[PDB]
Write a protein that binds this ligand. Sequence first.
Ligand code: HEM
Ligand code: NCT
Length: 407
Amino acid sequence: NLAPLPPHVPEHLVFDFDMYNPSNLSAGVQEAWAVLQESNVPDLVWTRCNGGHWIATRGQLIREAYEDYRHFSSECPFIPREAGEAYDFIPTSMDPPEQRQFRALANQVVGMPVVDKLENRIQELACSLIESLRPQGQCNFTEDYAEPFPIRIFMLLAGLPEEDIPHLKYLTDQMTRPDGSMTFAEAKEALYDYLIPIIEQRRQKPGTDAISIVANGQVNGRPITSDEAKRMCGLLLVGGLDTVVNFLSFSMEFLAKSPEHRQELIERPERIPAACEELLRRFSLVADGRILTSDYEFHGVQLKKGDQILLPQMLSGLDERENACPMHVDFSRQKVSHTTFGHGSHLCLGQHLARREIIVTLKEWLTRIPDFSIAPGAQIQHKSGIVSGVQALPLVWDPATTKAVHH
Ligand code: HEM
Ligand SMILES: CN1CCC[C@H]1c1cccnc1
């Protein structure tokens, strides 16, 4: 339930929002979070849920905090406190200047140069999976394409066997949307338990895979340690198994419900890149934060050292003060403003990979299965957390309105 209100918190700023189970969940997860942006709600509130923490509700506040790493540290970035304290991935748990040197190494394994070179494999996997579903006239998108498409692409890049997916997928999910069976510390340790032996073997006999590159990597001229490699690989694992996987579902759910918007992409293919950005704004899904390094007055609100503050990446683009008709999806929107990949020194390094996976999915799906919809009488349930997602997305279509395209 609720944590007792801290001495310095003003009662008029209390809004008991629960990030792991928002009250307006059934209306759609983004909609649930948007309640924090209704006219009467202040720019900075305090919730007594999940141990108690502040919550910036507007893009201006969210962008500011992420830029100011001196007052807002990434050292304890998760809600609840025990999870944030136990979180030590690299570079996500570091603040500049220390974290800077580690980004370059991560770029070597997931940056644009590597992505460009994966294009053919990404398109090939997308086409086989899709053509595999096309004649069926149905599927549950989360298990049939959303999880397998991005996860296998990553498992390949990392040199990790596909049979290890169910175990790793379960562990990463306990870190973002815990079902209660595991604490954040335990899931993290089980992940390190999986990676440790592998990093040791990759340093003994290195291959060309992502993990061999990081384990035998160098940061600012010095060699990376075994502990630092483990901390970087864990972050990469969560990225391949719990980011794009959830995003693809929100996107396909929307496309399933808007024969209009998909028709726009079928008729005008060149706007798919632009559509991707708009969908990334409308269906933003990440929400982590920072911890106060000292007593600080921020926009008239007294914050005390150690207070945690959620800065939902998903909220910036949904803010009416950033985009005029927020809940409306407009592919032709002139200034698609958002912070879906973060803001400040920690801007997502996997975004280039993310965009190619989204863009290839939209093009290869619409090209083969242009007509489709939500299964008869099904009500789509969303799930909330550090990374929001979709519980199940069953789709249906008439096979006769599809077409097999050779890749
Ligand atoms: C739709 C997909 C994705 C979204 C929305 C997303 C979002 C984010 C966000 C919000 C951050 C910064 C968090 C913070 O400031 O604390 C971030 C960091 C990061 N992301 Fe992603 N990401 C996505 C996909 C991926 C993928 C696929 C990979 C890699 C396989 C990846 C690798 C990274 C890395 C390395 C960082 C750390 C950067 C740093 O801390 O300096 N991400 N991502
Ligand atoms: C799931 N995480 C929570 C905060 C950042 C996010 C993440 C992890 C790995 C790659 N990109 C984003």
